[PDB]
Amino acid sequence: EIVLTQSPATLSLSPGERATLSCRASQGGNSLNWYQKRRGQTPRLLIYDTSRRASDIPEKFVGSGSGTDFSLTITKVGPEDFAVYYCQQFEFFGLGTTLEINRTVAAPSVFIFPPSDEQLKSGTASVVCLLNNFYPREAKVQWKVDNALQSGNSQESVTEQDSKDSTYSLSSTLTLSKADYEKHKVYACEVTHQGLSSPVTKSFNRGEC
């Protein structure tokens, strides 16, 4: 079979920059295809047979390559050209590459939300922490229950790129039983990030306003 590597995965393209990826296929001697896929929508073919544009496609999409390595090129990236990109060789497919809008600063802001009383009457508690923006995506959201660092009992929800301001957002939800929640008092969220001079902690005490 044939291996297809799409390294690297993502890069920050300022509106107007040029893209250059690498489809270092295992066994050359063949061609390659390219697909633009805005997630939630269907893939759109762009370049077929190593280097050829498909029907009704703007000439900003440029493809080339030979042997094992291949290259795609976009001239002046548009607002709807930020998506995923995949290459193929016959029955064997690639993994994909993501495009992202740049700048953006470096600092995350942090809201905290205690579980509602209505939910406690069901036997479970959900502590939701809210982050806006925060690039780079390397986060270190640490949960602290009475200064006891928590791990393995929370889950995260990240990307939702807005075309208006190129901002991010992120949720990490802590799930505990009704019992364990009332067992402790202080609940904090430790957001350690590179664009933060010092780790920001937002907290609340159980039962208070």
């Binding site: 061609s31 295809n33 697909y35 269907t42 893939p43 759109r44 073919l45 077929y48 047979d49 050829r52 498909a54 029907s55 995949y86 193929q88 060789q89 016959f90 029955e91 064997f92 497919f93 690639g94 993994l95 994909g96 809201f111 905290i112 939300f113 205690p114 579980p115 509602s116 209505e118 939910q119 069901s122 959900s126 939701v128 809210l130 806006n132 889950q155 995260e156 929800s157 990240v158 990307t159 939702e160 957002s169 949720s171 939800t173 799930t175 609340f204 306003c209």
Partner: protein, 225 residues
Amino acid sequence: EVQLVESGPVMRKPGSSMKISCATSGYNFRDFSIHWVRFNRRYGFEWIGWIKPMWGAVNYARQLQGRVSMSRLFSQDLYYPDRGTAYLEFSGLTSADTADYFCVRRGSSCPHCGDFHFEHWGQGTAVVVSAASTKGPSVFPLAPSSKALGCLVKDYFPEPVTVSWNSGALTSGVHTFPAVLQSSGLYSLSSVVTVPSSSLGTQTYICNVNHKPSNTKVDKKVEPK
């Protein structure tokens, strides 16, 4: 133009089977092979197989032998012939068979180009497989601190859930996160909205969570304390 249209969303218990159709139009059904591709969520793409509707000849992927069968059917009408639907049968469903399934066809353009240049994609068919059952969500408030506000949509199945505020009057500053699959087999997501801290005693905020599979609609009002 050439279009490919597939059947609606599908959820199946593990061990079950599914038959997905794929209506075609805008070209001659006989002249082109139809391949089936599933957009493997966070796995990329895995090619399933093709069918040449001349004799219904098929070639199934080796890593799917004994679980997949394909067939075709030509147009019944005498006034609108040359069309036709293609079909995909999938048996013995488990966990890894949760994906978005597409019917594709090689774009009509060149001769030398091999039979794997998919220019035409169907709208797709989302397919979920678990032991969970259709359930309507509860809606708890993420109340604003007295020192943003939102709604968390928890314990529902299956996808999706759409989120709008005040019947679609407040759209700016709204952040509806993607759903997360809990260990319980049921989904959950979070939706928040940043608003002025002065309008927390004069403005009413309401989140319209919608869940069509369970035919559920909740009107929730988020307030401080």
